Structures are given as structure tokens and as C-alpha cells.
Symmetry: none
Subunit: 181 residues, 2 copies
Amino acid sequence: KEINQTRDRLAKLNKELASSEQNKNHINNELKRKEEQLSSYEDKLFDVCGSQDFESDLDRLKEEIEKSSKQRAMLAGATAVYSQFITQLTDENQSCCPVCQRVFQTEAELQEVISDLQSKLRLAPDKLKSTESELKKKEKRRDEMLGLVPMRQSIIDLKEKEIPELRNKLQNVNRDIQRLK
Amino acid sequence: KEINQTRDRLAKLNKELASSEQNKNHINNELKRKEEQLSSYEDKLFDVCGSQDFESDLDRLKEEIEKSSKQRAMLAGATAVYSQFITQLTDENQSCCPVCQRVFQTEAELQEVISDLQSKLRLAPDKLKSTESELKKKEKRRDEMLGLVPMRQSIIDLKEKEIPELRNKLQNVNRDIQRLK
Ligand SMILES: [Zn+2]
């Protein structure tokens, strides 16, 4: 049985080496996925935050969103008001002022007042679009931030527990492989 | 050699069932946890926002926030424009009109105009407070659902990916078991 005993160990050792070799790839691939997963979170977190203080970035982002919308109000308000004035002074049979209700004594006046308002609104609709794009962009950024708040933990769990734990598994399996060869 | 072999078939089959039975337990305990985990996420999400359709409710809330904010923008702007008019005729001691720039000959006129602008604005504060209130409530609910986005992601991973995969491993393993016994 002596030769047969050694036949037995040799087979047993091969079954050990094969299953370790399996794990090594298995683990290696899990490590690869967890690292990519982390890498992605750090990229999104990076694209989304312009600083190290989250509560502050969010606070400063909120202030910007407030400025833009106040701007939006101005543009939107003036646009509507003047637009109405202009349509009163033209399409309606008013030869008078829309604010002080005073008749325009000469036709020259009427045109210049129309003329003044026409120019005051001259870039207004255009600026209102730009402001709306920036406002939309900011809010979207705000939305993503609020969604990354609750996996602060998860991103940290990968970096400090799971991934180093896996490298440790890969180390132990690598020790087992070298023990056999 | 017939008996010796028949015990042999029996040993292998018993060793298959033992390892299969093991899987059923391991797999079952995995399914038990994923199901609890899913169950808790669903309870939590529903307790925070009472939403049964998440992506659609959130998208619609966002649309409402957009319409309401657009409305208020135009209201506030328009109010600001007229407010400015009034402050021009008063605090700036201007005796001219802001639109047609025509001087006020009498204080009587000027007063009529001042008085005229104020009444146009008399309903403004009430509308502005109402609109900002409705809007504040929508935003808070939107912020809360935004904090639940990754929890909704987990719920979707559990319900559509992880748990059906496990139920399928339990199916095939159960068949493997029933085939031996
Ligand atoms: Zn006037």
C-alpha cells in the first residue's frame, strides 16, 4: 500500500491545488469588481462635489440656486410686464401711456415710448433661457448630491473593510498555492 | 464484486445528498436574509414617502416643482417691476413717469399714479406667500425621495436580480435532492 498511499496524497494534493486555483481567479475577479465599483463612486462623488465639506458645498450650491432663480424672476417678470405694455401701446387702440394713462400728445412720443420698451426687452427672452439652463444644471447637481449622501457608508465599507478583506483572502489562497508548488 | 460496488454507489449518493442538503441550507439562509433586507427597505421607503411607484412619482413631483417655481418666478418678477416703479416716484423724489418718462405737472397726478400702482400689487403678498408655501412642501418631499434613491436601487437589485437568482438555485438544488431521495 506504500506506493498507493503516495498515490492517494498525490491525488488529494491535486484536488486541493485545483480548488485553490479556482478561488484565486474567483477572488481576483471579485476584487476587480469591488475596485471598479469603488472607483466609480469616487468619480461620481468627485464630479458632484467641488470640495471636502459636503454640508458646505450643498449650502453654497443652494445659495447659487437661490441667486439664479431670483435672476429668473427678474428676467421673467420684466419680460412679461414690458411685453404687456408694448402690446397695449400697439395692438390696442391706446394712444396713451400704460402707467400714467396720459394720452400721447404727438405721435412721435408714442413711437419713442414703444421704442424704449422694445429695446429694454431686447435680450430678455434669450437671457431667460440661459438662466433656465444654468438653473436646471444646478438643481440636477443638487439632486445627485442628495442621492450620494446615503452611501457615504457604503463607499467607506468597500475601502476599509471589504476590499482589504478580499486582498487578505487572495493572500491566504496565494500562500496555499505556493505551499503546493 | 456486486455487493462491494453497491455499497459504493450508496456512499457516493449519500455524499452527493449531504453536500446538496448543505447547499439548500446555505442558499436558504441567504434567501432568508435578502428577503428580510428587501422587506425592510420597502417598509422604510414607504414610511418616508408613501410611494408605490418611485421613479414616476419622483419625476412628477419634479415636474410640479418646475411649474410652480416658474409661476412664482413670474409673479415675483412682475411684482418687483411695479414695486420698483413705485419706489422711483417716491423714495427717489422723481417727478417723472418711469415708462414714458414724462414729468408730473401736479402732485395730484403723481399721487393718483402711485396709488394706482399699489392697488395693482395689493394681492401680491398673499399670492407669493401661498405659492412659496405649496412649493416648500413639494421640495421637502422631493428631497426626501432623493435621499432614498440608493435604497430604491437596492430594492431593485434584490427584487429583480439577487432574489430570483437565489430562488432558482434553490429550485435546481431541490430537484437534485428529490432525485436522490
Ligand atoms: Zn407714463
